[PDB]
Amino acid sequence: EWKARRFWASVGIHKEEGGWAVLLDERPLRTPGKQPLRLPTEALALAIAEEWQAVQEVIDPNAMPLTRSANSAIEKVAPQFDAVAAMLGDYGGTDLLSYRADAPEALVRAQAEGWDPLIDWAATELRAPLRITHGVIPVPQDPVVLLKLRAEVASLDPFGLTALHDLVTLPGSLILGLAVIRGRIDAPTAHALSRIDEEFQAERWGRDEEAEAQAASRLAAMRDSERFWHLTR
């Protein structure tokens, strides 16, 4: 626990060759793995410095989302870039916006009004029109569309791919993720769209405390990813 106490007075950033560095007094911040922490932009450097300047008495890895995502980018995503990109790309074949409920009518309508504009956006802007199904039996997507979607993901930089991760896996939609990083919608909107079903059920049959707690947790993480994406551009 001694290792968690703050021992610095000031936090600053330094140019540094391979990206920006964050300095606790004179000492460079490093990743939990001893690897030097290098950020692609001064905007992210500055934001991470604020997290470390805000440390009270003890370091709380949970109150430091930007630092945590930067560590992941450096230690996990960049080195396994292709694998991560392939995994996010797979969501194109099982995208939430592609599966509509069969009933009741009011829910089918809610899904169409909320999701059809995003499916349209994907067909128009990403040239990735998705086949949509009603029910639970998986419908086959055009192989070419799936490849374009995987390319959209794989064309990202490592810090950007790190941001996209939660924006796709939490709501369970590659389109909602891409729509956020492309500015078509913001994270809170993507979160609201992803839970049309959950919200529908809640209003008609009653809220579920744990599900609401789980949704609040997903939204917070999605906003963290969105913030990380913008700071790293």
Backbone as a ProteinNet text record, in pm:
[ID]
protein_1_A
[PRIMARY]
EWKARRFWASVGIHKEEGGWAVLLDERPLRTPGKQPLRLPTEALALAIAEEWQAVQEVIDPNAMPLTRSANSAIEKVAPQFDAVAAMLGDYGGTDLLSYRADAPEALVRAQAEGWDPLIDWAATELRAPLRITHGVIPVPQDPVVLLKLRAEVASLDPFGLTALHDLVTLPGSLILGLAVIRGRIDAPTAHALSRIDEEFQAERWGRDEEAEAQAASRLAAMRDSERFWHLTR
[TERTIARY]
83.2	0	85.4	208	299	318.7	326.7	347	238.5	124.6	15	7.6	96.7	92.8	158.9	103.1	157	285.2	388	519.1	567.6	477	514.9	440.4	500.1	438.9	369	434.8	380.3	382.7	289.9	281.8	287.5	374	387	407.5	414.6	433.8	557.6	620	739	736	773.9	778.4	813	936.3	981.5	966.8	1065.8	1064.9	939.7	944.5	831.3	706.8	646	525.4	552.1	445.4	457	471.7	538.7	559.7	495.2	458.8	397.8	501.1	527.6	629.3	575.8	605.8	567.3	696.7	691.9	810.1	910	1019.8	1120.6	1110.2	1043.9	1032.3	921.1	956.9	861.3	764.9	638.2	536.1	560.7	547.3	567	442.8	433.3	319.5	338.5	230.5	248.8	358.2	390.3	492.5	633.3	662.1	795.4	823.3	732.7	750.7	722.4	804.4	785.7	649.9	577	446.1	458.6	426.3	433.2	295.9	247.2	116.5	128.1	38	40.5	8.7	-49.1	-86.8	-66.7	-50.2	-31	-161.2	-273.9	-404.4	-426.9	-382	-399.1	-296.7	-175.5	-69.1	-123.2	-174.4	-230.3	-344.4	-433.5	-545.1	-497.7	-400.8	-349.9	-277	-206.4	-137.5	-237.6	-356.8	-456.4	-501.6	-511.6	-552.7	-447.4	-319.7	-215.6	-199.9	-238.6	-229.4	-345.3	-453.1	-571.6	-558.2	-452.3	-437.1	-434.9	-518.7	-528.3	-411.8	-435	-332.1	-280.5	-372.7	-340.4	-390.2	-313.2	-347.2	-460.7	-566.8	-682	-695.2	-641.8	-645.9	-783.4	-888.3	-1023.6	-1063.6	-1011.2	-1043.2	-950.8	-876.5	-782.6	-806.2	-924.3	-960.9	-867.2	-818.8	-730.9	-600.3	-545.6	-422.8	-442.6	-554.1	-582.2	-593	-659.2	-671.5	-537.3	-454.8	-323.7	-237.7	-247.9	-170.1	-212	-342.7	-394.1	-345.5	-351.5	-307.4	-162.9	-77.6	64.3	98.9	40.1	70.3	-11.2	-137.7	-221.5	-264.3	-325.5	-374.5	-267.8	-172.7	-70.6	1.1	46	115.4	30.4	-100.3	-188.9	-290.2	-248.5	-334.5	-422.4	-362	-440.9	-547.6	-510	-605.1	-722.4	-692.3	-798.6	-889.3	-827.6	-902.4	-993.7	-943.7	-1022.2	-1142.2	-1119	-1225	-1336	-1297.8	-1398.1	-1467.4	-1390.3	-1448.5	-1557.2	-1543.2	-1642.4	-1781	-1787.7	-1917.6	-2004.4	-1942.2	-2019.5	-2114.5	-2076.5	-2160.3	-2268.5	-2260.7	-2358.9	-2396	-2418.4	-2449.2	-2589.2	-2595.5	-2720.5	-2828.3	-2789.2	-2886.1	-2945.6	-2890.5	-2937.1	-3045.1	-3067.5	-3166.7	-3282.8	-3399.6	-3517.8	-3606.7	-3681	-3768.9	-3886.6	-3959.9	-4077.1	-4200.4	-4192.4	-4306.3	-4265.2	-4349.5	-4477.6	-4452.7	-4556.5	-4548.1	-4480	-4513.8	-4457	-4304.5	-4249.9	-4104.8	-4039.3	-4103.5	-4049.6	-4040.7	-4143.6	-4146.5	-4035.2	-4013.4	-3910.8	-3773.9	-3749.1	-3621.8	-3601.6	-3706.4	-3695.3	-3670.3	-3743.6	-3726.1	-3586.8	-3535.7	-3404.7	-3287.1	-3299.3	-3189.3	-3181.1	-3294.6	-3291.8	-3206.1	-3210.4	-3127.2	-2976.2	-2939	-2799	-2761.7	-2855.5	-2827.1	-2810.4	-2892.5	-2885.5	-2752	-2713.9	-2588.1	-2473.9	-2478.6	-2372.8	-2368.8	-2486.3	-2492.2	-2440.8	-2479.2	-2438.5	-2293.2	-2258.4	-2123.2	-2015	-2046.1	-1945.8	-1957.3	-2061.7	-2087.8	-2092.7	-2161.3	-2172	-2317.8	-2401.5	-2543.6	-2558.3	-2629.4	-2647.6	-2785.9	-2792	-2919.3	-2974.3	-3100	-3159.2	-3261.1	-3265.4	-3362.8	-3457.1	-3573.8	-3671.6	-3673.6	-3642.9	-3640.2	-3501.5	-3477.3	-3347.9	-3262	-3315.1	-3237.8	-3139.2	-3008.1	-2903	-2917.7	-2915.2	-2925.4	-2783.3	-2750.7	-2616.9	-2593.5	-2482.6	-2448.3	-2360.2	-2360.8	-2278.3	-2131.5	-2052.9	-1911.2	-1830.5	-1866.3	-1796.6	-1821.5	-1945.6	-1980	-1903.6	-1894.3	-1823.6	-1676.6	-1618.6	-1477.8	-1457	-1550.3	-1535.5	-1537.1	-1628.3	-1638.3	-1511.5	-1454.5	-1330.9	-1218.2	-1219.4	-1118.3	-1133	-1256.9	-1281.6	-1209.6	-1218.3	-1156.5	-1005	-957.6	-815.5	-738.5	-809.2	-742.7	-711.2	-752.4	-729.3	-588	-552.7	-423.8	-447.8	-341.3	-357.2	-430.9	-409.2	-480.7	-626.9	-650.2	-787.4	-860.7	-790.2	-850.8	-886.9	-802.9	-826.2	-956.3	-975.4	-1098.4	-1221.8	-1210.9	-1323.2	-1366.8	-1272.1	-1302	-1431.9	-1439.3	-1560.5	-1682.5	-1660.7	-1771.7	-1841	-1772.9	-1830.7	-1878.9	-1790.5	-1823.6	-1928.3	-1936.1	-2036.4	-2176.8	-2202.5	-2338.1	-2359.4	-2249.9	-2257.5	-2288.7	-2232.3	-2258.6	-2138.2	-2090.5	-1980.2	-2032.9	-2155	-2207	-2218.1	-2271.2	-2281.2	-2141.1	-2043.7	-1908	-1853.4	-1856.8	-1806.2	-1881.1	-2012	-2090	-2040.5	-1992	-1941.1	-1806.4	-1712.9	-1582.7	-1585.6	-1691.5	-1704	-1786.9	-1837.5	-1914.5	-2059.3	-2110.3	-2249.8	-2341	-2296.2	-2372.5	-2272.6	-2316.6	-2220.6	-2241.2	-2154.2	-2163.3	-2295.4	-2344.1	-2471.1	-2585.3	-2582.4	-2687.3	-2674.4	-2551.4	-2525.5	-2576.5	-2547.9	-2594.1	-2748.9	-2816.1	-2962.9	-3021	-2958.3	-3003.6	-2986.7	-2873.6	-2848.6	-2948	-3006.8	-3099.2	-3246	-3283.2	-3423.3	-3509.9	-3462	-3535.4	-3547.4	-3432.7	-3424.8	-3513.5	-3503.2	-3580.7	-3730.4	-3761.5	-3900.5	-3960.8	-3893.6	-3937.8	-3950.2	-3850.9	-3853.6	-3978.3	-4014.6	-4129.5	-4262.1	-4265.7	-4390.7	-4412.7	-4307.2	-4319.7	-4245.3	-4169.8	-4096.4	-3944.4	-3880	-3734	-3668	-3548.4	-3470.5	-3343.9	-3333.5	-3219.8	-3079.7	-3056.1	-2925	-2897.7	-2998.5	-2982.9	-2959.3	-3025.7	-3005.6	-2864.3	-2817.8	-2682.5	-2583.4	-2610.3	-2520.8	-2517.3	-2632.6	-2639.6	-2563.8	-2574	-2503.2	-2352.1	-2308.1	-2167.1	-2120.3	-2204.4	-2166.1	-2156.4	-2252.7	-2253	-2128.5	-2090.3	-1972.4	-1848.7	-1836.1	-1720.9	-1723.2	-1842.8	-1855.2	-1814.5	-1854	-1814.6	-1662.5	-1603.2	-1456.5	-1387.3	-1442.7	-1384.8	-1396.6	-1512.5	-1538.3	-1435.4	-1424.1	-1326.4	-1185.3	-1148.1	-1015.7	-995.8	-1100.8	-1091.9	-1064.6	-1141.7	-1125.3	-991.4	-948	-820.3	-703.5	-717.5	-607.6	-608.6	-692.8	-692.1	-588.5
-123.6	0	126.9	116.2	230.8	282.5	188	217.2	307.1	318.3	400.6	545.6	586.5	723.6	823.3	943.9	1048.4	1104.5	1114.5	1163.3	1277.9	1335.5	1443.9	1572.6	1685.3	1813.1	1868.8	1856.7	1909.3	1809.2	1827.4	1741.1	1825.2	1785.7	1856.7	1761.9	1818.5	1740	1785.6	1694.4	1730.1	1676.9	1763.4	1731.9	1586.5	1547.4	1410.4	1366	1292.3	1244.3	1164	1034.1	947.7	976	1092.4	1128.2	1206.6	1252.3	1329.7	1245	1301.3	1234.4	1317	1250.3	1315.9	1301.8	1411	1409.8	1440.4	1351.5	1370.2	1436	1567.7	1645.7	1623.1	1553.6	1528.4	1389.3	1297.6	1159.4	1130.6	1066.5	1031.5	922.8	941.1	844.3	721.1	602.7	480.9	392.5	295.2	204.5	107	43.5	-50.9	-154.1	-172.8	-268.5	-213.5	-97.2	-36.5	27.3	8	66.1	215.7	295.8	441.4	478.9	568.2	609.8	724.3	696.2	796.7	816.3	939.4	976.1	1043.1	1009	1066.4	1215	1273.7	1413.4	1490.1	1621.2	1708.6	1722.1	1708	1718.8	1604.6	1485	1369.4	1378.6	1421.9	1440	1531.6	1647.8	1743.3	1688	1610.6	1553.2	1446.7	1364.7	1264.4	1335.8	1444.4	1519.8	1570.4	1609.5	1657	1543.5	1422.3	1310.2	1293.4	1299.5	1282.2	1402.1	1520.6	1637.6	1634.8	1566.7	1556.3	1449.7	1369.6	1266	1329.7	1277.7	1328.8	1276.8	1166.8	1108.8	980.1	902.4	774.8	767.6	699.4	683.7	582.8	621.6	534.1	507.7	393.8	355.7	363.1	368.4	376.6	517.9	615.9	755.6	812	723.8	766.8	693.1	714.8	649.8	672	795	824	750.3	749.9	678.2	529.6	474.6	332.9	299.1	383.6	354.5	370.2	465	484.6	363.4	309	189.9	75.3	53.4	-51.6	-34.1	88.5	115.7	70.6	112.8	79.8	-67.3	-125.3	-262.5	-373.3	-345.9	-449.4	-430.4	-316.9	-294.9	-278.4	-187.2	-168.6	-298.5	-376	-501.1	-613.8	-609.4	-712.3	-646.4	-535.9	-458.2	-537.9	-626.5	-704.6	-792	-860	-945.7	-861.6	-751.3	-665.5	-612.7	-568.8	-514.7	-622	-745	-854.4	-884.6	-880.5	-908	-801.2	-673.9	-568.5	-581.2	-612.8	-627.5	-733.7	-839.4	-946	-896.1	-785.7	-734	-695	-668.6	-632.1	-743.1	-867.3	-980.5	-1013.1	-952.3	-977	-844.7	-743.5	-610.5	-596.3	-538.8	-515.6	-451.1	-354.5	-284.6	-370.5	-490.1	-583.3	-679.7	-684.8	-778.5	-706.6	-715.6	-647	-747.5	-700.3	-788.8	-825	-929.8	-970.8	-906.6	-875.4	-816.1	-763.6	-679.3	-634.9	-525.2	-488.4	-385	-253.5	-205.1	-80.5	-87.4	-205.6	-217.8	-222.4	-291.6	-302.9	-162.9	-83	54	140.8	125.5	202.9	172.3	44.9	3	59.4	54.2	105.4	255.7	330.9	475.5	513.5	437.6	471.1	417.4	295.3	230.9	243	257.6	267.7	384.4	500.2	613.4	580.1	495.1	458.1	352.3	264	162.9	238.8	341.7	421.9	494.1	554.9	626.9	532.7	408.9	312.8	274.9	262.8	226.3	343.5	465.3	586.5	630.7	658.5	702.9	595.9	475.5	369.3	274.8	294.1	207.6	64.9	50.1	-80.8	-104.7	-138.7	-164	-301.1	-304.9	-429.7	-488	-620.3	-687.7	-698.6	-662.4	-667	-779.7	-843.1	-949.9	-924.3	-987.4	-977.3	-1116.5	-1127.4	-1257.2	-1289.5	-1416.5	-1457.6	-1542.8	-1581.2	-1662.3	-1575.2	-1593.3	-1517	-1510	-1388.6	-1369.5	-1344.6	-1398.8	-1380	-1242.3	-1177.7	-1047.2	-1066.9	-968.2	-971.7	-975.3	-1070.5	-1081.3	-952.9	-877.4	-753.2	-646.2	-636.5	-540.4	-572	-700	-738.5	-700.9	-715	-679.9	-528.8	-450.3	-305.8	-263.5	-322.3	-288.3	-325.7	-442.4	-481.1	-382.2	-330.3	-235.3	-101.6	-61.9	62.9	57.3	-58	-76.5	-85.2	-174.4	-196.4	-74.7	23.1	142.9	244.7	215.2	305.5	300.2	405.6	413.5	334.8	288.8	211.9	279.5	409	477.4	490.1	508.8	520	387.2	278.1	145.4	113.3	159.1	139.3	210.2	331.5	403.5	331.6	288.9	222.6	93.8	25.2	-101.8	-103.3	-22.1	-18.4	38.1	131.1	190.9	87.3	-23.9	-132	-248	-295.5	-411.7	-387.6	-267.3	-245.3	-246	-161.5	-166.7	-292	-354.2	-472.4	-438.1	-327.5	-280.7	-209.4	-259.6	-195.8	-64.8	-64.1	62.1	171.7	140.1	242.7	292.3	201.9	244.2	337.8	294.1	377.4	509.5	507.4	631.1	731.3	681.4	771.7	830.7	745.6	797.6	881.9	868.4	949.2	1074.6	1090.4	1209.5	1210.7	1098.2	1093.6	1098.9	1042	1048.4	1059.1	1095.8	1099.5	973.9	952	831.6	817.8	926.1	909.7	866.7	915.6	880.7	734.9	689.8	550.9	461	500	422.6	414.2	527.5	532.6	445.7	450.3	369.4	221.7	184.7	44.5	-15.3	65	4.5	33.4	48.5	72.9	-40.8	-163.7	-281.4	-278.6	-265.3	-259.6	-146.5	-29.3	87	62.9	1.4	-31.9	-120.6	-230.6	-322.3	-250.6	-168.7	-97.5	-12.2	61.7	151	77.4	-36.5	-110.9	-207.8	-279.6	-379.9	-356.1	-246.4	-215	-221.5	-122.4	-112.5	-224.5	-263.5	-365	-296.1	-283.5	-218.6	-258.4	-388.4	-434.7	-401.4	-418.2	-385.5	-234.9	-153.4	-8.8	25.7	-45.3	-23.3	-63.4	-175.5	-221.6	-123.6	-66.4	30.4	158.9	201.1	321.5	301.9	179.7	148.2	148.3	96.6	92.1	234.9	320.2	458.3	532.9	515.2	585.7	541.6	410.8	361.9	408.5	419.8	467.6	615.9	695.5	835.5	844.8	754.8	755.8	728.5	634.7	599.3	712.8	777.7	890.1	1000.3	1035.1	1137.3	1100	973.4	926.5	937.2	906.2	915.7	1062.2	1156.1	1297.2	1354.9	1322.5	1372.9	1320.4	1202.5	1147.7	1180.1	1272.2	1303.9	1411.3
0	0	0	50.9	52.6	-90.1	-183.3	-324.2	-382.5	-315	-366.3	-317.7	-227.2	-175.9	-270.2	-276.5	-362.5	-302.3	-386	-344.7	-432.7	-511.2	-600.5	-566.7	-602.2	-574.2	-697.2	-811.4	-935	-1049.4	-1142.8	-1259.3	-1385.6	-1478.3	-1603.9	-1721.4	-1841.3	-1962.3	-2037.4	-2110.9	-2185.9	-2328.2	-2422.3	-2565.2	-2594.6	-2564.3	-2586.2	-2731.9	-2781.2	-2919.2	-2952.5	-2924.9	-2953.4	-2871.6	-2893.2	-2820.6	-2693.5	-2628.3	-2505.4	-2379.4	-2279	-2151.2	-2040.2	-1931.3	-1817	-1705.3	-1634.7	-1529.9	-1391.8	-1297.4	-1158.5	-1109.3	-1092.2	-1055.5	-1168.6	-1140.9	-1243.9	-1306	-1236.3	-1282.2	-1384.1	-1496.5	-1602.3	-1556.1	-1589.8	-1554.4	-1641.5	-1583.4	-1660.4	-1652	-1741.2	-1741.4	-1627.2	-1580.9	-1470.6	-1499.1	-1627.1	-1665.1	-1682.7	-1624.5	-1634	-1770.5	-1865.7	-1998.4	-1994.4	-2064	-2067.9	-2128.7	-2062.3	-2111.6	-2210.5	-2336.2	-2441.5	-2504.8	-2497.2	-2549.7	-2686.3	-2779.5	-2914.5	-2926.4	-2822.9	-2830.3	-2701.1	-2714.6	-2600.5	-2522.7	-2592.3	-2526.8	-2427.4	-2463	-2374.8	-2261.8	-2296	-2196.8	-2087.7	-2127.8	-2033.3	-1948.8	-2010.5	-1936.2	-1835.7	-1874.4	-1781.9	-1666.5	-1696.2	-1590.9	-1486.2	-1530.6	-1436.7	-1347.4	-1402	-1317.5	-1207.3	-1243.8	-1141.9	-1049.2	-1095	-1009.3	-911.9	-950.2	-865.2	-756.7	-761.4	-659.4	-519.6	-430.5	-294.2	-210.3	-139.6	-54.7	-115.2	-170.3	-229.9	-373.4	-457.1	-596.6	-608.1	-678.5	-699.9	-850.1	-897	-1038.6	-1104.4	-1023.3	-1076.4	-1112.9	-1039.8	-1066.9	-1174.2	-1240.7	-1344	-1475.8	-1536.8	-1663.2	-1782.6	-1799.2	-1912	-1896.9	-1775.8	-1750.7	-1777.6	-1729.7	-1750.7	-1900.6	-1978.3	-2120.7	-2192.2	-2147.3	-2209.6	-2181.9	-2061.2	-2028.6	-2120.9	-2134	-2221	-2363.7	-2413.8	-2550.4	-2568	-2474.9	-2478.4	-2454.9	-2350.9	-2314.4	-2379.4	-2410.9	-2469.4	-2613.8	-2644.1	-2779	-2888.3	-2870.8	-2974	-3010.9	-2910.9	-2942.7	-3001	-2979.7	-3033.3	-3124.8	-3185.9	-3274.1	-3369.6	-3448.1	-3543.9	-3477.4	-3370.3	-3301.2	-3248.3	-3180.8	-3128.2	-3239.8	-3348.8	-3460.9	-3521.7	-3530.4	-3586.8	-3497.5	-3367.1	-3270.7	-3276.4	-3281.9	-3291.6	-3426.3	-3529.7	-3662.1	-3668.3	-3588.5	-3587.1	-3550.4	-3476.7	-3438.7	-3556.3	-3670.5	-3787	-3827.8	-3798.6	-3834.6	-3733.1	-3615.4	-3509.7	-3444.8	-3527.6	-3477.9	-3421.9	-3302.3	-3232.2	-3320.4	-3403.5	-3486.8	-3597.6	-3616.3	-3718.7	-3669.7	-3539.2	-3485.8	-3421.8	-3484.7	-3433.4	-3359.7	-3260.8	-3186.8	-3276.8	-3239.6	-3316.2	-3254.8	-3125.8	-3057.3	-2921.3	-2859.9	-2916.4	-3021.3	-3095.5	-3200.2	-3158.3	-3039.7	-2991.8	-2978	-2951.1	-2937.4	-3076.4	-3169.9	-3306.5	-3364.9	-3339.5	-3389.7	-3327.4	-3197.6	-3127.1	-3186	-3212.6	-3268.6	-3407.4	-3488.7	-3624.7	-3626.4	-3546	-3543.5	-3492.5	-3396.2	-3343.6	-3422.6	-3474.6	-3545.1	-3697.3	-3765.6	-3911.4	-3960.8	-3892.6	-3938.1	-3927.5	-3831.8	-3817.6	-3920	-3953.1	-4054.2	-4186.7	-4207	-4329.8	-4338.1	-4226.5	-4216.8	-4253.5	-4204.4	-4233.6	-4381.7	-4442.6	-4583.9	-4668.1	-4630.4	-4702.4	-4677.8	-4552	-4518.6	-4518.4	-4471	-4465.8	-4583.5	-4663.7	-4777.8	-4722.9	-4610.1	-4546.4	-4509.8	-4609.3	-4583.9	-4519.4	-4407.7	-4335.5	-4354.8	-4363	-4376.7	-4235.2	-4217.2	-4084.8	-4071.2	-3954.8	-3933.5	-3818.7	-3826.3	-3719.8	-3662.9	-3534.2	-3469.9	-3418.2	-3387.8	-3334.6	-3427.3	-3543.2	-3636.5	-3717.1	-3694.1	-3762.7	-3914.6	-3968.2	-4112.5	-4165.6	-4284.6	-4342.1	-4407.5	-4371.8	-4428.8	-4552.5	-4641.5	-4762.3	-4718.8	-4770.8	-4733.7	-4755.3	-4858.3	-4890.5	-4784.6	-4738.4	-4635.5	-4506.3	-4472.5	-4352.1	-4361.3	-4480	-4500	-4490.3	-4543	-4532.1	-4385.9	-4309.5	-4168.8	-4093.8	-4122.6	-4055.4	-4088.8	-4211.5	-4257.1	-4186.3	-4160.7	-4089.9	-3954.9	-3889.7	-3759.7	-3768.6	-3854.2	-3871.3	-3923.6	-3980	-4032.2	-3923	-3800.4	-3688.8	-3631.3	-3558.7	-3489.2	-3359.1	-3290.1	-3165.3	-3048.8	-3028.9	-2921.4	-2963.7	-3092.8	-3139.4	-3129.5	-3158.1	-3151.5	-3006.5	-2914.5	-2772	-2734.9	-2784.7	-2753.7	-2811.1	-2935.9	-3001.8	-2928.6	-2866.1	-2799.3	-2717.8	-2612.5	-2530.6	-2602.7	-2695.2	-2770.1	-2857.2	-2882.7	-2963.5	-2875.4	-2788.9	-2705.9	-2596.9	-2540.5	-2436.8	-2496.4	-2597.7	-2653.1	-2740.2	-2782.8	-2867.8	-3012.8	-3060.8	-3197.6	-3258.8	-3371.9	-3441.2	-3502	-3555.9	-3610.5	-3506.1	-3387.9	-3285.2	-3247.6	-3242.3	-3208	-3315.7	-3441.5	-3549.1	-3556.8	-3531.8	-3535.1	-3429.3	-3315.6	-3212.2	-3253.7	-3294.1	-3328.7	-3455.1	-3534.2	-3654.8	-3630.2	-3508.4	-3477.2	-3521.8	-3571	-3613	-3489.4	-3376.4	-3251.8	-3135	-3015.6	-2905.4	-2819.8	-2723.2	-2643.4	-2567.5	-2506.3	-2435.6	-2530.8	-2654.2	-2751.4	-2792.4	-2816	-2852.6	-2739.2	-2614.9	-2500.3	-2500.8	-2520.9	-2523.7	-2636.7	-2753.4	-2866.2	-2838	-2777.6	-2751.7	-2653.5	-2565.6	-2470.6	-2494.2	-2620.7	-2650.1	-2593.8	-2606.3	-2559.2	-2406.9	-2340.8	-2194.3	-2139.6	-2201	-2160.3	-2184.9	-2298.1	-2331.6	-2222.2	-2192.7	-2088.3	-1953.1	-1919.3	-1792	-1773.8	-1878	-1871.8	-1872.9	-1940.5	-1950	-1834.2	-1795.6	-1692	-1561.4	-1553.3	-1431.1	-1438.1	-1377	-1373.4	-1293.2	-1335.5	-1264.9	-1212.2	-1080	-1014.2	-1058.9	-1069.5	-1110.2	-1255.7	-1340.9	-1482.4	-1497.7	-1415.9	-1424.1	-1375.4	-1273.3	-1221.7	-1330.5	-1396.4	-1501.4	-1618.6	-1651.1	-1760.7	-1724.2	-1599	-1556.3	-1567.9	-1542.1	-1548.5	-1694.4	-1783.6	-1924	-1981.1	-1946.3	-1994.1	-1950	-1824.4	-1775.3	-1852.2	-1877	-1951.1	-2097.1	-2155.1	-2294	-2302.7	-2204.1	-2204.2	-2188.5	-2109.6	-2091.4	-2226.7	-2302.8	-2431.7	-2530.4	-2528.8	-2617	-2582.3	-2454.4	-2412.1	-2460.2	-2443.3	-2483.8	-2634.9	-2709.6	-2854.1	-2896.1	-2842.1	-2879.9	-2836.9	-2715.9	-2667.6	-2751.2	-2811.5	-2890.6	-3039.7	-3082.6	-3224	-3257.1
[MASK]
+++++++++++++++++++++++++++++++++++++++++++++++++++++++++++++++++++++++++++++++++++++++++++++++++++++++++++++++++++++++++++++++++++++++++++++++++++++++++++++++++++++++++++++++++++++++++++++++++++++++++++++++++++++++++++++++++++++++++

